[PDB]
């Protein structure tokens, strides 16, 4: 296995395409749950240690994950490249399309139903995906086909992106 | 008869006696609402959670499953219940049919995104979890609203009373 | 007490006991709806028709209406007012009946399809007017929400049947 | 492994193997759609009904759903998620299936005609809710474009069946 | 197997192996698009055109279609259904193909500009119509979002090619 | 005379450009009447024996007729090629334009007034014409200029198509 690792200053993050346990400590509860979902659905192991508001943390974590993904992508030579996933979450349906293209581009098309989920600013979801996709040099389209519950909306998007990414990273 | 199960840690029992209810979900607003449910349904609830959306949904799923155990044991019951509840400006109607056809029609646009720290979008999630897992057909209608706490309380009181009516032995 | 008559071939009896019902209208869908009526109203119905769906549905409703009226006239103290809401998956119906002696139907239900099987759905309002007017009831039928026509009609039959049985209850 | 039950008289079995399918629902159109289901899901279905279309259609859906749940409960690792697009000339349908344990159907398809032959087109949604809710699946059915009602329903049945088949694939 | 024919002079062959492709249509933009087709479908194309863009584009599409039909007729068991989403910066396209034997194209893409370079953009639909009808496929082409015309028609070519390659996969 | 014949399995169909009696047994009453009209107005003799819902039957009959027409067209070398017919049916007026072009294409522009005529699903009319036109490799435009009665609408369309086809098949 390859492990890609980065310290940015206060974050310490590693990612790996093996099946080791993930340890996610962002200091943001909702972000913890979402990145735990990312690890399971992408097949990638994340270890995050953050020290220190939610905006800087979420964005800086997204930037580092994107940068480490690019390192991972650079070292792979032959992969599926294209991944599409539909995920339903009760009333919600999301579609995410990723192309490991080297052309950094995000089309984010999801009007989330509430301004917060618990204490988490829902506007941070697009900021996270922008940071990851652009720094990983992916072309990604995120579409909320229908929604209703904001937790479901965000979760479907995280599940679909992770799975689509996983599919695209599959060795050829 | 006591129906119970476990499902973080969640321990819940429900019973149609008048034993005291102990409700500790870890969510203040949900405690108050489920306290209302016990009173208006006549069902005793005991809930122990140690560990908001996952908690709320988990509790609703377990309540619904336990309700189905209870219903399966009952032979002869009223089956149909309707209740209107006013809360100042608010008026809600809930209609329940213990039909064995799991179906929720939830028609209530709540006035605010939160009450205290509680996400109001959780109300629909709780009711869907209960109704579907209890195999009820339930229509919840907010005829008029205004104050979000009143809207939610009216819906809880109406559902609970309508359920209590439908569960009544014949 | 049994109330009965013929309308000529049509022969129908109604009773407020728990005796069995035999319903042979020659219209399958109507058979199923009248079976719902007997169960939810608490009344026993026996119908023998012999010998188009319009005439048969309407004739049955008129005779049922007239027989209900006989039964009402014999009763002294009854509840008089009945309301029932019935949900049927997507559908919610409300029916309000008043045994007032003032024959009046307010029928507010746009049914989703022109037929269920071979049965013309326009016959549902025709059945209810025949019953309500001839029994001298005041009734309001409201489809609060709908979607499936079989569900819409069944909800209405159930709600009306139960609201009538409530209203007919001895006092 | 074979999954089996009876409920009118209804007798149904399902199996994730290649045994032959005998489908006799009493409803010609539903016979055809269930034949598509077997071929496209890879699940063998045997159905014998003896004993309106509404009750038959819904009762079959409920049992198929209950038997799918038996099958799912035995399976350990499976793909879980399935999506299928099926074109039928002018029609395009998409069906997304999640074997989630959370019973939920989003049915988004405005069918072009009230009937295909003698079959009430509103029965299609009733069938899918019966299966999906009782199998504890989350499914979204979407008619992306349509035109001809037989094509619309056929595309939906093919897409759902294929998506279920994908989701059930052992890991 | 190599499928070839000639139809100004046009000579084309197509093969389901990894032989290099030589594409000389006399239309620069079409050369690039067909090179994308070769790579994404896995099919080797060889084209010699000797001798307006309309006639060449349409004739090439017809011959490719007819040769694909020859290939399909030779194959026994194949996947049959393929769907591909392809993003191209701002653009997202979806193509659904079904090797059905029912020739049908649903082309749903309003392209942003009348020309890319000297190439008439209205020729893209004409190309796909020629291919899809003559290969006897049912395909739906959908531009979900666009912006840049080069990106729009590259996304469409990529998605069709992949969807076809998937559908052509032996089972 | 040439006779073109096909068995597809349960249909047995022959078509001929002579003037022999037609025997049409599709198992669909309304389709029987329409194909009887086709035979008279096109000048082509049809013999159909079908064994066995209406959708599959109508479509399969349309497909075979289209395929046999193509065989017939292939063997003719010199014909008028272009045919246009207007047919009035009381309130209804239809126009059908056919080009024996070899480019399979149907433009069907007729909103029929009712969902059924007797027991026949009126949506089958377009399915029939699509099957015939595409498999015969005709370019055909069908236009209901005005309508009112669905039986008249379908009949005018069948009459006009048959006549236009007949005209186009005329030897040159
Ligand atoms: Mg960019
Ligand atoms: Mg949830
Ligand atoms: Mg979650
Ligand atoms: Mg309160
Ligand atoms: Mg009348
Ligand atoms: Mg039903
Ligand atoms: Mg019924
Ligand atoms: Mg049809
Ligand atoms: Mg067809
Ligand atoms: Mg079919
Ligand atoms: Mg052209
Ligand atoms: Mg480019
Ligand atoms: Mg390019
Ligand atoms: Mg065409
Ligand atoms: Mg005529």
Q: What gap in Å lies between CA B20 and CA A69, rounded to an integer?
A: 55
Say yes or no: D149 and D85 in one domain.
yes
Q: Residue A115 corresponds to which tokens in the numbers above?
A: 């301004």
Strand partners, B106: B140
D83 touches chain A (CB under 8 A): yes
CB contact at 8 A, D63 and D10: yes
- CATH code where residue D163 lies: 3.30.230.40
Q: What is the DSSP string of A107-142?
A: EEE---S-SEETTEETTHHHHHHHHHHHHTT-EEEE
E90 touches chain A (CB under 8 A): yes
CB contact at 8 A, C47 and C62: no
Say yes or no: E71 and E28 in one domain.
yes
Residue E71: name the closest of E24, E148, E129, E17 by CA: E17
SS3 E109: coil
SS3 D116: strand
SS3 F172: coil
**End of a domain among B78, B98, B114?**
B78
Q: What gap in Å lies between CA E151 and CA E157, rounded to an integer?
A: 10
CB contact at 8 A, B40 and B153: no
Do the strands A92-99 and A139-146 form a parallel or antiparallel pair, or are they unpaired?
antiparallel
Where b means 16+ CB within 10 Å and e means fewer, F127-150 reads: bbbbbbbbbbbbbbbbbbeebebb
Please name the helix (run of DSSP H) or strand (run of DSSP E) that holds residue F117, with its range, or none: strand F116-117
Note the ligand closest to the C-alpha atom of B88.
4
Do the strands B118-119 and B114-115 form a parallel or antiparallel pair, or are they unpaired?
antiparallel
**End of a domain among A80, A114, A144?**
A80
In degrees and rounded to multiples of 5, residue D21 shows phi and psi of -110, 130
Strand partners, E58: none
Residue F14: name the closest of F40, F59, F50, F41 by CA: F50
Residue B121: name the closest of B29, B34, B48 by CA: B29
Q: Residue C25 corresponds to which tokens in the numbers above?
A: 């209208």
Residue F61: name the closest of F117, F121, F135 by CA: F135
The answer to whether the CB atoms of F54 and D89 lie below 8 A apart is no
Nearest CA in chain A to B112: A114
Q: Residue E100 corresponds to which tokens in the numbers above?
A: 């059905």
In degrees and rounded to multiples of 5, residue D11 shows phi and psi of -135, 115
Say yes or no: E143 and E66 in one domain.
no
Helix axes F124-135, F150-169, angle to 10 degrees: 10
Please name the helix (run of DSSP H) or strand (run of DSSP E) that holds residue F83, with its range, or none: strand F82-89
Note the ligand closest to the C-alpha atom of E102.
9
Q: Which chains touch F (3 or more CB pairs under 8 A)?
A: D, E
Sign of CA dihedral F154, F157, F158, F159: positive
DSSP summary character for residue A148: S
Q: What is the DSSP string of B104-116?
A: EEEE---S-SEET
D162 touches chain E (CB under 8 A): yes
CB contact at 8 A, A129 and A109: no
Where b means 16+ CB within 10 Å and e means fewer, B2-32 reads: ebeeeeeebebbbbbeeeebebebbbebbeb
Q: How far is CA C149 from the centre of its chain?
A: 17
- Which experimental method was this entry solved with? X-ray
Q: What gap in Å lies between CA C101 and CA C81, rounded to an integer?
A: 12
Beta strands in B37-153, from DSSP E residues, in sequence order: 44-50, 80-87, 90-97, 103-107, 114-115, 118-119, 137-144
Residue A143: name the closest of A74, A57, A85 by CA: A85
F130 touches chain D (CB under 8 A): yes
CB contact at 8 A, E141 and E156: yes
A171 is in an annotated binding site: no
CB contact at 8 A, E163 and E137: no
Q: What gap in Å lies between CA E95 and CA D34, rounded to an integer?
A: 27
Surface-to-core class of residue C20, CB atoms within 10 Å of its CB (0-12 exposed, 13-18 middle, 19+ buried):
exposed
Q: What gap in Å lies between CA A120 and CA A30, rounded to an integer?
A: 7
Say yes or no: B166 and B86 in one domain.
yes
Q: What gap in Å lies between CA B106 and CA D104, rounded to an integer?
A: 14
E80 is in an annotated binding site: yes
Q: Residue C94 corresponds to which tokens in the numbers above?
A: 């409300």
Q: Residue C57 corresponds to which tokens in the numbers above?
A: 């549905």
Beta strands in chain A, from DSSP E residues, in sequence order: 3-8, 11-16, 23-25, 45-50, 82-89, 92-99, 105-109, 116-117, 120-121, 139-146
Helix axes A124-135, A54-75, angle to 10 degrees: 30
SS3 C110: coil
Say yes or no: C84 and C153 in one domain.
yes
Say yes or no: A5 and A37 in one domain.
yes
B150 is in an annotated binding site: yes
Task: Give distance in angstroms: CA of F119 to centre of ligand 7.
Answer: 25
**End of a domain among A80, A115, A132?**
A80
Say yes or no: C66 and C85 in one domain.
no
CB contact at 8 A, F125 and D84: no
Q: Residue F61 corresponds to which tokens in the numbers above?
A: 């009959």
In degrees and rounded to multiples of 5, residue B2 shows phi and psi of -110, 130
The answer to whether the CB atoms of B137 and C92 lie below 8 A apart is no
Say yes or no: D12 and D86 in one domain.
no
Backbone region of residue B101 per phi and psi (left: phi > 0; alpha: psi in -120 to 50; beta: other values): beta
Q: Report chain E's C-alpha Rg in angstroms.
A: 15
Residues with CB under 5 A from ligand 1 (ion): A 105
Say yes or no: C62 and C100 in one domain.
no
Q: What gap in Å lies between CA D101 and CA A160, rounded to an integer?
A: 18
Q: What gap in Å lies between CA F81 and CA F73, rounded to an integer?
A: 10
Q: Residue F142 corresponds to which tokens in the numbers above?
A: 């069908």
Instruction: Give the range of the structural domain holding residue E105, as residue numbers without chain letter.
Output: 80-171
Q: Residue F152 corresponds to which tokens in the numbers above?
A: 């008249």
Say yes or no: C57 and C101 in one domain.
no
Q: Which residues contact C76 (CB under 8 A, 6 or more apart)?
A: none
Q: What gap in Å lies between CA E162 and CA E95, rounded to an integer?
A: 9
CB atoms within 10 A of CB F172: 8
Q: What gap in Å lies between CA E11 and CA E22, rounded to an integer?
A: 11
Where b means 16+ CB within 10 Å and e means fewer, D112-126 reads: bebbbeebbbbbbbb
Please name the helix (run of DSSP H) or strand (run of DSSP E) that holds residue F92, with its range, or none: strand F92-99
Say yes or no: E32 and E103 in one domain.
no
Half-sphere exposure of D72 (CA within 13 A, CB side): 21
Q: What gap in Å lies between CA E115 and CA D102, rounded to an integer?
A: 50
Say yes or no: B71 and B108 in one domain.
no
DSSP summary character for residue A21: P
Strand partners, E170: E78
DSSP summary character for residue D121: T
Whole-Å CA distances, A71 to A38, A100, A138, C144: 18, 12, 12, 59
Q: What gap in Å lies between CA F90 and CA F93, rounded to an integer?
A: 8
Q: What gap in Å lies between CA D147 and CA D89, rounded to an integer?
A: 9
Q: Which residues contact F93 (CB under 8 A, 6 or more apart)?
A: F86, F87, F144, F145, F146, F156
Q: What gap in Å lies between CA D51 and CA C80, rounded to an integer?
A: 40
Residues with CB under 5 A from ligand 9 (ion): F 59
Q: Residue D63 corresponds to which tokens in the numbers above?
A: 């049992």
Backbone region of residue E26 per phi and psi (left: phi > 0; alpha: psi in -120 to 50; beta: other values): left
CB contact at 8 A, D103 and D136: yes
Sign of CA dihedral C88, C94, C96, C102: negative
Q: Which residue has the tokens 């001929």?
A: F16
Sign of CA dihedral A111, E91, E134, E43: negative
Sign of CA dihedral B43, B47, B52, B56: negative
Number of domains in chain F: 2
In degrees and rounded to multiples of 5, residue B75 shows phi and psi of -90, -60
Set of chain A residues whose Cβ sits within 8 Å of the Cβ of B114: 116
Q: Which chains touch E (3 or more CB pairs under 8 A)?
A: A, D, F
Beta strands in E19-137, from DSSP E residues, in sequence order: 22-24, 44-50, 81-88, 91-98, 104-108, 115-116, 119-120
Q: What gap in Å lies between CA A136 and CA C152, rounded to an integer?
A: 54
Give the gap in angstroms from C-alpha A96 to the nearest C-alpha of chain B.
24
Q: Which residues contact A72 (CB under 8 A, 6 or more apart)?
A: A2, A4, A15, A17, A169
Helix axes E149-167, E123-134, angle to 10 degrees: 10
The answer to whether the CB atoms of C89 and D52 lie below 8 A apart is no
Surface-to-core class of residue A121, CB atoms within 10 Å of its CB (0-12 exposed, 13-18 middle, 19+ buried):
middle
Q: Residue A94 corresponds to which tokens in the numbers above?
A: 């999301």
Residues with CB under 5 A from ligand 3 (ion): A 155
């Amino acid at each position: 296995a390859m492990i890609y690792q980065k310290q940015r200053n206060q974050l310490n993050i590693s990612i790996s395409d093996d099946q080791s346990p993930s340890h996610i400590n962002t200091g943001v509860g909702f972000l913890n749950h979402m990145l735990t979902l990312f690890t399971f659905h992408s097949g990638l192991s994340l270890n995050i240690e953050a020290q220190g508001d939610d905006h800087h943390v979420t964005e800086d974590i997204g930037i580092v994950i994107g940068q480490l993904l690019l390192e991972m992508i650079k070292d792979k030579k032959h992969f599926v490249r294209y991944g599409t996933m539909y995920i339903p979450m009760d009333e919600t349906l999301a579609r995410v399309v990723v192309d490991i293209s080297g052309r950094p581009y995000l089309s984010f098309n999801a009007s989330l139903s509430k301004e917060k989920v618990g204490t988490f600013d829902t506007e941070l979801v697009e900021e996270f995906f922008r940071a990851v996709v652009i720094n990983a040099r992916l072309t990604t389209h995120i579409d909320l086909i229908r929604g209703g519950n904001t937790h479901h909306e965000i979760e479907a998007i995280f599940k679909a992106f992770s799975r689509a990414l996983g599919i695209a990273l599959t060795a050829t």
